[PDB]
Amino acid sequence: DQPHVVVCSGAGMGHLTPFLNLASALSSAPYNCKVTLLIVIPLITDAESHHISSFFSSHPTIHRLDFHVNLPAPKPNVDPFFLRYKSISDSAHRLPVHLSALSPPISAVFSDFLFTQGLNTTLPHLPNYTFTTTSARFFTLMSYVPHLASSSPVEIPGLEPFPTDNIPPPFFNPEHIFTSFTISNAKYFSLSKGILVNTFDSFEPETLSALNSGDTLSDLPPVIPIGPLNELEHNKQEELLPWLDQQPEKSVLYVSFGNRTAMSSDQILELGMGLERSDCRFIWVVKTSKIDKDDKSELRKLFGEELYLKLSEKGKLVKWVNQTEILGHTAVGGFLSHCGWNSVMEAARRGVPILAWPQHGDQRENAWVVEKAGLGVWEREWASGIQAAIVEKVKMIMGNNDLRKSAMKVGEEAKRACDVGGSSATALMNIIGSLK
């Protein structure tokens, strides 16, 4: 009968939502698995807590397993999420006693890469699919981190070189907190049954081809595209939908840099000045210390009254959205994004052209993948002239006919890939089929 599988989620929105999406897909037709979704508690952000609660309330047949990992003490000059990621990696070896109590006996685990060493050493007989949450392109660099020595381009044989400006500088320091648990877990990728990627074959064909053909990266297991993951339905309907319903097709710019972006007040002000001068309407997710989603006093102070009024007449300034509901609306014509990979793939699914302003980490390589696929354009020096960058490029994404067509073609292939019979759905069905 039906396989029982465990999905091991990590921490942070970007490392949570693809695991929720996978859990949801595997619990439903045509996969029809019994799914236990492991959640690391405590959670760090309220966004995480509400997303998880809402998920389990709307997926009653999915079983929740709370995996308690003590919060690490803060340390000066160490990022709190990196400290949390390290605590998860350090705790993964404790999973045997927790997974052994599950019934019926589990057939497989699908896990964040932070769990790799713990799962592949203490549960070596349990098939572990390491589900990376970044692009296939950046995953290859991460898997190569244990072999780094430099300020030269990194050339993984068989792949286009990685320029220095696209590699997080900490990757060259094995003692950096992030590099340390990247190295310790990448060293056990070879014991994973496969690497799953939230991507699709026609989106990263050169990378996937190299990895698979053998070799580049001899010792990796098969690297399997399973994206885009079919979207969740959300408990509460998106509050901006009736307004979006009133806008012409493809006339609204969606703007979001996510929870992990550190834009200063000066940068936010310049961005607002640029938007006020553009012709399109917008939805802009702006971070505010006030907890009430409706309190705009901080924005009024930041922009000043005249600018704020003009901005609020032309678009929506909000604290949070259901992103997939926004990107799925016919009124949204473009996406100014930091290119966090979940956001890239949600835009790919809907064929939404991207204006890429990457901030840190994998985002520059993600932006390059987006530009190479024809899904968007990457503004390499956005931070050196924010207002001008906005005025010139927003008009272009919103109207350029060639980019609109190439982005639409990405959307058609992305939809095809996750539909019944799609290349990604076929790959996932074959994984589940191999458990029966």
Q: Mark the segment that binds ligand UPG (CB under 6 A) among 119-127, 162-170, 339-347, 392-400.
A: 339-347
* Residue among 4, 15, 59, 329 flagged as catalytic: 15
Among 17, 89, 116, 140, binds ligand UPG (CB under 6 A): 17
Question: How many whole angstroms separate alpha carbon 332 and alpha carbon 283?
Answer: 9
CB 255 within 8 A of CB 285: yes
Query: In the set 24, 140, 182, 256, which binds ligand UPG (CB under 6 A)?
Result: 256
CB-closest chain residue to ligand UPG: 14
Structure tokens at 44: 């760090």
Place of tokens 């840099």: 257
Least Cβ distance, residue 357 to ligand UPG (angstroms) = 12
Residue closest to 317 by CA, chosen among 268, 362, 278: 268
Contacts of 204-210 with C-beta under 8 Å, sequence gap 24+, read: 204/135, 204/136, 204/137, 204/369, 204/373, 206/159, 206/160, 207/135, 207/136, 207/137, 207/140, 207/159, 208/136, 210/140, 210/158, 210/159
Q: Which of 346, 365, 379, 413 binds ligand UPG (CB under 6 A)?
A: 346
Residue 184 φ/ψ region, left for φ over 0, alpha for ψ in the -120 to 50 degree band, beta for the rest: alpha
Per CB under 6 A, the list member of 9, 192, 207, 323 interacting with ligand UPG is: 323
Region from 9-17, 34-42, 156-164, 187-195 binding ligand UPG, contact rule CB under 6 A? 9-17
Query: Can residue 14 be called a binding residue for ligand UPG (CB under 6 A)?
Result: yes
Question: Would residue 219 show up in a list of annotated catalytic residues for this protein?
Answer: no
**Would you count residue 285 as binding ligand UPG (CB under 6 A)?**
yes
How far apart are CB 97 and ligand UPG at their closest, in Å? 29
Geometric angle at alpha carbon 341, from 4 and 264, rounded to 5°: 130
Amino acid of residue 322: N
| Site size for ligand UPG (CB under 6 A) | 26
Least Å from the CB of residue 14 to ligand UPG:
2
Please provide the distance, in angstroms rounded to a whole number, between the alpha carbons at the two ends of the chain: 7
* Residue selected from 111, 324, 329, 349 as contacting ligand UPG according to rule CB under 6 A: 324
- Out of 4, 51, 59, 112, which one is annotated catalytic? 112
Contact range with ligand UPG by CB under 6 A, out of 266-274, 276-284, 337-345, 370-378 = 337-345
Stated as kind and residue range, the H or E segment containing 223 is strand 223-225
**Under the criterion CB under 6 A, does residue 320 sit at the interface with ligand UPG?**
yes
Binding site, annotated residues for UDP-alpha-D-glucose: 14, 17, 133, 321, 323, 338, 341-343, 346, 362-363
The number of beta carbons lying within 10 Å of the beta carbon of residue 46 is 10
Smallest distance from ligand UPG to CB 350, Å: 12
Annotated binding-site ranges: 14-15, 17, 77, 133, 321, 323, 338, 341-343, 346, 361-363
The yes-or-no answer on residue 112 being catalytic is yes
The token pair at 61 is: 């047949």
Q: With 0-12 CB in 10 A as exposed, 13-18 as middle and 19+ as buried, what is 214?
A: exposed
Q: Please state, in angstroms and rounded to a whole number, the distance separating the CA atoms of residues 344 and 14.
A: 11
Q: Would you count residue 179 as binding ligand UPG (CB under 6 A)?
A: no
Between 3 and 12, name the residue whose CB sits nearer to ligand UPG: 12
Complete edge-to-edge strand list for the sheet that includes strand 63-68 = 63-68, 34-41, 4-8, 108-111, 128-132, 194-197, 223-225
Neighbours of 425 (CB within 10 A): 20
> Does residue 354 bind ligand UPG (CB under 6 A)?
no
Q: In the set 3, 6, 7, 12, which binds ligand UPG (CB under 6 A)?
A: 12
* Touching ligand UPG, residues 134-153 (CB under 6 A): 134
Return the exposure string of 159-181: e unless at least 16 CB atoms fall within 10 Å of the residue's CB, then b.
Answer: beebeeebbbebbbeeebbbbbb
Q: Which of 133, 140, 185, 278 binds ligand UPG (CB under 6 A)?
A: 133
Chain contacts with ligand UPG (rule: CB under 6 A): 12-15, 17, 133-134, 256, 258-260, 285, 320-324, 340-343, 346, 361-363, 366
Task: Catalogue the active-site residues.
Answer: 15, 112
